[PDB]
Write a protein that binds this DNA or RNA. Structure first.
Lengths: 129, 49, 60, 50, 210, 323, 148, 167
RNA sequence: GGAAAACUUAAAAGAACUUUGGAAAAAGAGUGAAAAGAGCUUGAAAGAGUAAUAUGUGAACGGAUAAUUUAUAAGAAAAAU
RNA sequence: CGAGAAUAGAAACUCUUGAAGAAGUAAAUUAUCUACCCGUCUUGAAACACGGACCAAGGAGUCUAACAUGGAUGCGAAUGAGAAUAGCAGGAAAGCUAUAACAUGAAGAGAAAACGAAAAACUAUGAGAGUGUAGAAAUACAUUUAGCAAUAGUAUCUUUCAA
RNA sequence: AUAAACAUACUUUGAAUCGGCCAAGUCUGGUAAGCAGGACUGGCGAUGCGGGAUGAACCGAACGUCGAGAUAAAGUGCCAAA
RNA sequence: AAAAUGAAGACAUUUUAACGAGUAAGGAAACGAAAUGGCGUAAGGACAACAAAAGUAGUAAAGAUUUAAAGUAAUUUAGAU
């Protein structure tokens, strides 16, 4: 069973004038200018982040697979979610070595925990190996 | 001044920054005086009265 | 640099946000400035009634 | 008894914790996906409710 | 812990004193350990290295044995005749080694190494016998209080206390309410995880019996 | 006040003593984490050394503004000529090599004040929280093997401890070594610019050995073990009992320290003798438990039945919905 | 704690909560108590109406130790010796011992008479006595003693 | 839109204990339970007064309890505040329930034969409140209230915060 | 009056001989764990060069909606009696 | 003919597409609709108003001191006494201890001399607690008692020329 | 009569502001002004959206993100839905 | 906002109803039914594999460039180089 996840807006709320100037990044900032075209919500430029875009509470922070992300660092952190394998998916942290990644991936199979980084830091065994 | 307050009387119109005395030597005055007291306790021994 | 001298514009709208505060009931029951004799008469009875109430308290 | 959230699987000579059962006493269970019922077959001459 | 206010535990001052040390002090820092045979002969752990000594490389790529041909106190390194690299155009150059990666296997003892080795050996004996005086006094105090026990117990295995006496204190009820949310969730998660590990172990034990 | 007994253990032989000691009254003081946070926040600032920038830093030029009419901003400019510095920006806070925003003065307020009775209140609530195994373990301590969480060792065993091999033995006997080994195995290196200042190692916390006046000679044995801090019973503070503003320290007591707790902190009915003018407070509740009131109220048939909210029917259109 | 200041919640707001029309300029009417009689007169009238002027005679060198005279009411006399001593001599009268309350020893010089006295004889020793203080002490069966 | 008189803003009534006190947080939980279940106006009153700020929970001396319980012999005083000791006057025998008791006040109450109770025992013994006297301390005695207003006023002048050249 | 300017590597092992060139250099070759190649740790943005892809009548860029192309991406169980 | 009520009954389905890539999402292009230069002063700027060629790094409500209000905290007719200062263990700018000067407060008025607070209070409204009856599910009325906080007003008392 | 318990009464502390401009079944000075100054109210400033081709103030109507419908001002030859 | 439930679940609980424009300006922290909710930078004190080796890391840290995912957003997460 997996509920239908509804995203009210899949675009990005890019900062005003970020498309014209390289010094202005794309991370959102509220236009506070007295004469600003966007904060006055003129026609055409009337797109600001509001709480009305908030996604449903039931499916908020839900991965496309229907589970939730649980960052793990070693084999013991898998035991924290072994009782909720239908709710949480493992996610090995970016700094975990390739050797420890094998133990986390191997143990998660035993405890039936889905891992979303199951193909990360694989050894040279792709071509002719 | 706005709203109800006391009339302020602060004597900082002079150069207080050169008039500031800090007590960072307070923990070491205790050691200096106590040690001098002990050497005073000897020399005139007994009765450093 | 002449300026506009005066205007009552927006003054009634301002005065009705927190509307006209009525005085409390205790404002109408003040006694200062009353008749001298009536105050003398009232004080005499209040003293008499209080002194009679207090002797009952001593009795019981 | 096995908790309802626990479905042990066989470990192929992998390192296992102290509490996890060994392979000699773990029986693999087939994955079950179908949970609804097919439409019942009725008499040839009776008409379907639909 | 260090209780000497005169010496400094600042890393910057320690490295600075290393780079600006005079030649007299650089000799002592450039010290190497005597081998097994030499240690028995002289009862000396280590000495400053010297030219014409014979060492044996114990750490690095090449564990060769050679003779010391240079003691470069500016770089805090030494040179060995058997550890060289051919400098492209044919000629060879010595390879620098730190004196802590070698052990001395043969001594060039003229007359002051003989005096130094004798002095070092005598000082080792005096401290060894000084420790014995302290050890027996510490042993004497222990025996006067536990006459039925000997001090060798401190080197053997320890048997922990197994008695598990509980105490009724009217604060265990409040304990869960005295934790903030971040540490309450961690504590409750640990309880749940610990309980589940016992549940699987009990299931394993039941299968093992049958 | 039943005042339950507390067992005293021999640190060498592991044998419990024959005479239990009643729990000191300081262990029933209210455990107030808001008071401790107030006191700990103030006390943690008292080890700070005074620091400040040079008073003349960035102000050592004769610079003046060029004024207007020269197509450059009005910030002061370095006078003279012949170098790259001349004609550059000057003292201004935004300029390079100029003074910063309000320069940090060394007469800042480094050390903080706290009322004495508030400090003694906080210490009492920190000794009380160390007798709760749920709070001690939640702080990150390994106390699953200790007999009693108010762990007391015989004073005769402490009198013979003179070496760190004997001190380690005593911690192994009373099952307190598991917390010591946690500090050894978890010792790591600090992350960030704090290493250039000399602070490199970062260790965890282990048992705190609270000793009396007759155990002064056993401090040397314990001080070299990683993650073992020793504090005298009279000199306790929130910096010891609640490090990191997290109460529930694992304390190993001694007989002399334990038997002085009633004198130092007094009783909930008696004035303290060690800390004159201080008495252990009473919590806002005598028995911090809601269960006994709920059942008693139910016994008198005073509580109504539990209500489950009815399901509000969805609005229907009776003009079109016949039902 | 500088992370709880208003400066951390006004980052991005141009004027930092000081307005666009009336800027945050250097002065807002002078320095210190300037203009106390010209343009801040409405402030001094409203909140300190007796600020300007003179009243009373100068004392060229005031000996403030002469005006030092701590006072204690009759209702607070027995608390100097405690309730235990008060109950011990509850049934005393003329002839046997009565506790002496030395106010000067406790730092009180003058005894004022306010509130009520427990109905026990008491000897009150002080430097000065109020008129009602002596009446209330005598009416309870006690005596008044002078000091210094 | 809709022509409303005012928009919805938070009601300025406290519904829980202020601060991080674990014991006061539980007392609000206890009396919030009693007020909802027993539906007694006594528990609603105690629950409401538990959520007041410290300046709105004024102290009540033992002399106030002595005067207010003269004609309530077999009764219990219930003040949701600290109870101080009036050292000028004696303490009769009476039962007091309060958040806190002064060390000298508790000794005087107990020495007279009375009992100092807390709000967990009162709820255990008198949950709905049967032989109780509700008491709150005076609020206008605060010396801060004297400076509120204008001191130039003709009717009720303020008290002129002392400062420079105060005569 | 008054600046700017820190970092090869563990170790110079700092290429070393041949062909092209007047030379500087380049291409091989070689050292090194790795060119990290002395303008030497990493190497951002502005600015350029190359390669792949796409568009085009007096600005350019942005947004909503589709279409085309590309990419990502959803499964091994299983019927009635 | 027929409401209520009583008696009994009848619903669990097809098809197409999808690892030869479904649904969704993103990127580029095309098309329809749509879109004036940001910051600022200003009644009013897209303005023929000023600053802005471009990028990186730096860059502006801070610290000390006095008062006040307010939220959390300790104690409470007292509070503080990390006032100087003197001791303790441990070696320590940390911690603990010191029947203690003083500060603020417990009494207020008067320029000052000189003084220095009860009718053991009163009135009004007001928080709460019980019973009875009925609707009847909660709840609604009658009746007994209590009178805190707050507000207003009274006697009485201290000082002042004047409350 | 009608409405009004997220009613009512407030208390304390404090911000910003006191250059304003527009409309009109209004007025005064002026020949008059997109002029100067006022009485009452609604606005713009601080405000986007649909319409008046364009427009700070006119008309309709005031705004969380959306789907389906009846509408307002005003429109229905094409640009432009009818 | 009101009811209901409430030692720990969890998504800052459940239900119902009303509401959501905005310059200047205000809404510090803490407060179980929370007296607005959060993101980011650096340093300090703690915590981070509970059975005596207890967060990650030469089986590849920080940083840089892009690709995807989560979040209304501030931003975070992961893959590849």
């Amino acid at each position: 069973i997996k509920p239908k996840i509804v995203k009210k807006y899949t675009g990005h709320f890019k900062r005003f004038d970020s498309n014209r100037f390289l010094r202005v990044k794309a991370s959102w900032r509220v236009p506070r200018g007295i004469d600003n075209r966007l904060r006055r919500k003129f026609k055409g430029t009337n797109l600001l982040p509001k709480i009305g875009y908030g996604s449903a509470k039931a499916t908020r922070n839900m991965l496309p697979c229907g589970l939730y992300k649980f960052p793990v660092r070693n084999t013991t952190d898998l035991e924290m979610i072994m009782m909720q394998n239908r709710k949480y998916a493992a996610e090995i942290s970016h700094a975990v070595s390739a050797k420890k990644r094998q133990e986390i991936i191997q143990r998660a199979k035993i405890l039936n925990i889905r891992v979303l980084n199951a193909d990360a830091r694989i050894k040279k065994q792709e071509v002719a190996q | 001044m706005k709203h109800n307050q006391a009339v302020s009387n602060i004597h900082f119109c002079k150069d207080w920054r050169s008039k500031v005395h800090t007590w960072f030597k307070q923990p070491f005055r205790k050691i200096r005086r106590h040690q001098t007291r002990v050497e005073k306790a000897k020399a005139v021994f007994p009765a450093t009265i | 640099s002449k300026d506009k001298n005066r205007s009552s514009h927006n003054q009634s709208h301002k005065a009705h946000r927190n509307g006209f505060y009525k005085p409390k009931k205790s404002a109408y029951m003040s006694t200062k400035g009353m008749n001298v004799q009536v105050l003398k008469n009232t004080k005499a009875q209040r003293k008499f009634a209080l002194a009679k109430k207090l002797e009952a308290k001593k009795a019981a | 008894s096995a908790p309802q959230w626990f479905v042990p699987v066989k470990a192929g000579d992998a390192k296992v914790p102290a509490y996890y059962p060994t392979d000699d006493m773990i029986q693999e269970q087939k994955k079950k996906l179908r949970t609804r019922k097919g439409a019942k077959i009725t008499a040839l001459d009776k008409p379907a409710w639909n | 812990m260090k209780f000497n206010c005169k010496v400094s535990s600042n890393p910057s001052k320690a490295r600075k004193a290393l780079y600006t040390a005079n030649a007299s002090q650089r000799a002592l820092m450039m010290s190497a350990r005597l081998s097994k045979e030499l240690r028995e002969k002289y009862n000396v752990i280590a000495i400053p290295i010297h030219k014409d000594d014979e060492v044996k490389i114990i750490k690095g790529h090449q564990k060769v044995a050679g003779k010391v041909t240079a003691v470069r106190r500016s770089k805090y390194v030494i040179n060995i005749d058997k550890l060289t690299k051919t400098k492209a155009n044919g000629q060879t150059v010595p390879i620098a080694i730190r004196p802590s990666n070698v052990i001395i296997t043969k001594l060039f003892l003229n007359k002051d190494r003989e005096a130094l080795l004798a002095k070092k050996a005598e000082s080792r004996k005096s401290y060894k016998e000084l420790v014995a005086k302290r050890n027996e006094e510490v042993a004497k105090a222990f025996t006067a209080v536990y006459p039925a026990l000997n001090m060798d117990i401190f080197g053997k295995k320890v048997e922990p206390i197994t008695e598990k006496k509980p105490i009724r204190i009217p604060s265990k009820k409040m304990a869960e309410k005295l934790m903030s949310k971040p540490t309450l969730r961690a504590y409750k998660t640990g309880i749940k995880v610990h309980k589940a590990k016992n549940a699987i172990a009990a299931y394993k034990a039941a299968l093992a019996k049958k | 006040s039943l005042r339950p007994f507390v067992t005293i253990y021999d640190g060498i032989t592991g044998e419990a003593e024959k005479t239990p000691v009643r729990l000191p009254a300081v262990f029933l003081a209210p455990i107030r984490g808001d008071v401790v946070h107030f006191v700990y926040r103030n006390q943690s600032k008292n080890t700070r050394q005074p620091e400040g920038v040079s008073t003349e830093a960035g102000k050592q030029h004769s610079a003046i503004s060029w004024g207007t009419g020269r197509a450059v901003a009005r910030i002061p400019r370095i006078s003279g000529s012949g170098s790259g510095r001349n004609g550059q920006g000057a003292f201004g806070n935004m300029t390079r090599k100029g003074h910063m925003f309000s320069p940090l003065k060394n007469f800042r307020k480094w050390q903080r004040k706290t009322p004495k009775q508030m400090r003694r209140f906080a210490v009492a609530s920190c000794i009380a929280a160390s007798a709760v195994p749920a709070l001690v373990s939640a702080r990150g301590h390994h106390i699953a093997g200790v007999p009693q969480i108010p762990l007391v060792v015989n004073s005769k065993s402490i009198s013979v401890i003179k070496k760190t091999k004997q001190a380690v033995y005593l911690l192994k006997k009373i099952n307190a070594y598991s917390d010591v080994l946690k500090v050894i195995a978890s010792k790591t290196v600090r992350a960030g610019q704090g290493k250039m200042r000399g602070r490199k190692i970062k260790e965890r916390k282990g048992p705190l050995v609270v000793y009396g006046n007759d155990d002064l000679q056993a401090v040397k044995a314990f001080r070299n073990i990683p993650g073992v801090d020793t504090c005298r019973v009279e000199n306790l503070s929130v910096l010891n009992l609640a490090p990191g503003c997290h109460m529930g320290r694992f304390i190993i007591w001694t007989e002399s320290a334990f038997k002085k707790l009633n004198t130092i902190f007094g009783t909930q009915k008696k004035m303290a003798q060690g800390k004159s003018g201080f008495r252990i407070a009473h919590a806002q509740m005598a028995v911090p438990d809601m269960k006994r009131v709920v059942v008693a109220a139910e016994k008198a048939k005073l509580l109504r039945a539990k209500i489950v909210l009815p399901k509000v029917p969805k609005r229907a259109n009776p003009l079109k919905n016949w039902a | 704690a500088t992370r709880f200041r208003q400066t951390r919640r006004r980052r991005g707001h141009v004027s930092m909560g000081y307005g666009r029309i009336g800027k945050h300029r250097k002065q807002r009417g002078g320095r210190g108590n300037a203009g106390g009689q010209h343009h801040r007169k409405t402030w001094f009238t409203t909140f300190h109406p007796d600020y300007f002027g003179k009243h009373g005679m100068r004392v060229f060198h005031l000996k403030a130790n002469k005006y030092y005279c701590p006072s204690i009411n009759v209702d607070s006399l027995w608390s100097l010796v405690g309730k235990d001593v008060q109950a011990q001599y509850k049934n005393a009268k003329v002839g046997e011992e009565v506790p002496v309350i030395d106010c000067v020893k406790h730092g009180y010089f003058k005894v004022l008479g306010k509130g009520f006295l427990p109905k026990q004889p008491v000897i009150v020793r002080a430097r000065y006595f109020s008129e009602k203080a002596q009446q209330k002490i005598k009416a309870v069966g006690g005596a008044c003693e002078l000091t210094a | 839109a809709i022509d409303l008189d005012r928009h919805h803003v938070r009601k300025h009534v406290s519904k829980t204990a202020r601060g991080n006190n674990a014991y006061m947080k539980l007392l609000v939980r206890l009396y919030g339970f009693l007020a909802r279940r027993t539906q007694s106006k006594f528990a609603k009153t105690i629950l409401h007064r538990l959520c007041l700020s410290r300046v709105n929970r004024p102290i009540v001396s033992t002399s106030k309890l002595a005067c207010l319980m003269k004609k309530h012999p077999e009764e219990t005083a219930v003040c949701v505040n600290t109870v101080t000791y009036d050292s000028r006057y004696p303490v009769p025998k009476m039962n007091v329930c309060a958040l806190k008791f002064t060390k000298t006040a508790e000794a005087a109450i107990t020495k007279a034969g009375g009992k100092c109770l807390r709000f967990d025992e009162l709820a255990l013994k008198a949950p709905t409140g049967r032989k109780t006297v509700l008491i709150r301390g005076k609020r206008n005695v605060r010396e801060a209230l004297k400076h509120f207003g204008k001191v130039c006023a003709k009717k009720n002048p303020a008290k002129q915060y002392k400062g420079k050249q105060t005569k």
